[PDB]
């Protein structure tokens, strides 16, 4: 009886297994804009993915995993809130069953179709398992999708899912640019907080972009024909893999932007 999103072992369960889902800096959450507070001390972010090697997509049975070549300083995100600099590992999304749901950050209470989340580990801590055992070992860089126009850097990502329809199965996935699933702006919102999945450590510099990127209803569509269960278990489509909103507590949302 593992942790996943159903009605008996879904986000509202995780606590028993994971206590530190009630805990003090816990993600996703709500980004009330008039509340967030303009911090001119932010810099720019950075976002230096021109040497980025992707190895390898994953179905872990809660999501699909593009995981990178973290064994040189390559795709490196830094500036912004950050101090030091954060190597890319993996990049994965959240989605809903339906174009109205999905995404784990709401923007006064909006939610998107989906959020695309970079996770970065901070070099200091000289790899993933360790960074995560920090407040400040992971950087994660959220952007939100809309249903609309194609997102043509998408494309290559949604015509390899047919190959990982189910949990346990990956298929080499190398040369992919994430530079193709960014928005034009990199204004932000950051604040502390946590993994949104088990083991939910409080180790996550959160920075979720305004802008939104579009991607197309037939490109959404392809993610949800994907698996929960293995292949020969009976079907369980992957849809509403995402952690509703969690209490702000004792935190402050900072905004890049005016
Ligand atoms: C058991 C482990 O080795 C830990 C160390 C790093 C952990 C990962 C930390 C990064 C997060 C990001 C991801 O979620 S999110 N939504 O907070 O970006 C899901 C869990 C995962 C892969 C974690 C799975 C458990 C990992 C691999
Ligand atoms: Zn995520």
């Keep these: ?18 206590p530190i889902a009630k805990g ?3 993600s996703p959450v709500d980004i ?20 980025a090697t992707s190895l ?10 593009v995981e990178f070549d973290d064994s040189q300083d390559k795709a490196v995100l830094k500036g912004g809130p950050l101090d030091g600099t954060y190597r890319l590992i993996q ?7 339906l174009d109205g749901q999905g995404s784990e950050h709401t923007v006064d209470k909006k939610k998107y179709a989906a959020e695309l989340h970079l996770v970065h580990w901070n070099t200091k801590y000289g790899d993933f398992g ?17 249903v609309g126009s194609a997102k043509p850097g998408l494309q290559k990502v949604v015509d390899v899912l047919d190959s990982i329809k189910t949990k346990g199965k990956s298929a080499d996935f190398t040369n992919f640019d994430p530079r193709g699933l960014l928005p034009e702006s990199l204004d932000y919102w950051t604040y502390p907080g946590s993994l949104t999945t088990p083991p939910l450590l409080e180790c996550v510099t959160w920075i979720v972009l305004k802008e939104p990127i579009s991607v197309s209803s037939e490109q959404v569509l392809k993610f949800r024909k994907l698996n929960f269960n293995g292949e020969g278990e ?17 935190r402050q949302i900072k905004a890049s932007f005016k």
């Design 32 to 51: 009330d804009t008039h509340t967030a507070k303009y911090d001119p001390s932010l810099k720019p972010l950075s976002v230096s993915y021109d040497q």
């Design 91 to 97: 990049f994965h999304f959240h989605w809903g069953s």
């Design 130 to 146: 360790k960074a995560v055992q920090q407040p400040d070992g992971l950087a994660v860089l959220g952007i939100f999708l809309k």
């Design 1 to 18: 009886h593992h942790w996943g999103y159903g009605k008996h072992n879904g986000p509202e369960h995780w606590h028993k297994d994971f």
């Design 24 to 26: 003090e800096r816990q």
């Design 234 to 250: 009976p079907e369980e489509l992957m849809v509403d893999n995402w952690r509703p909103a969690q209490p702000l507590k004792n």
């Design 56 to 65: 390898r997509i994953l179905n872990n049975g809660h999501a699909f995993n």
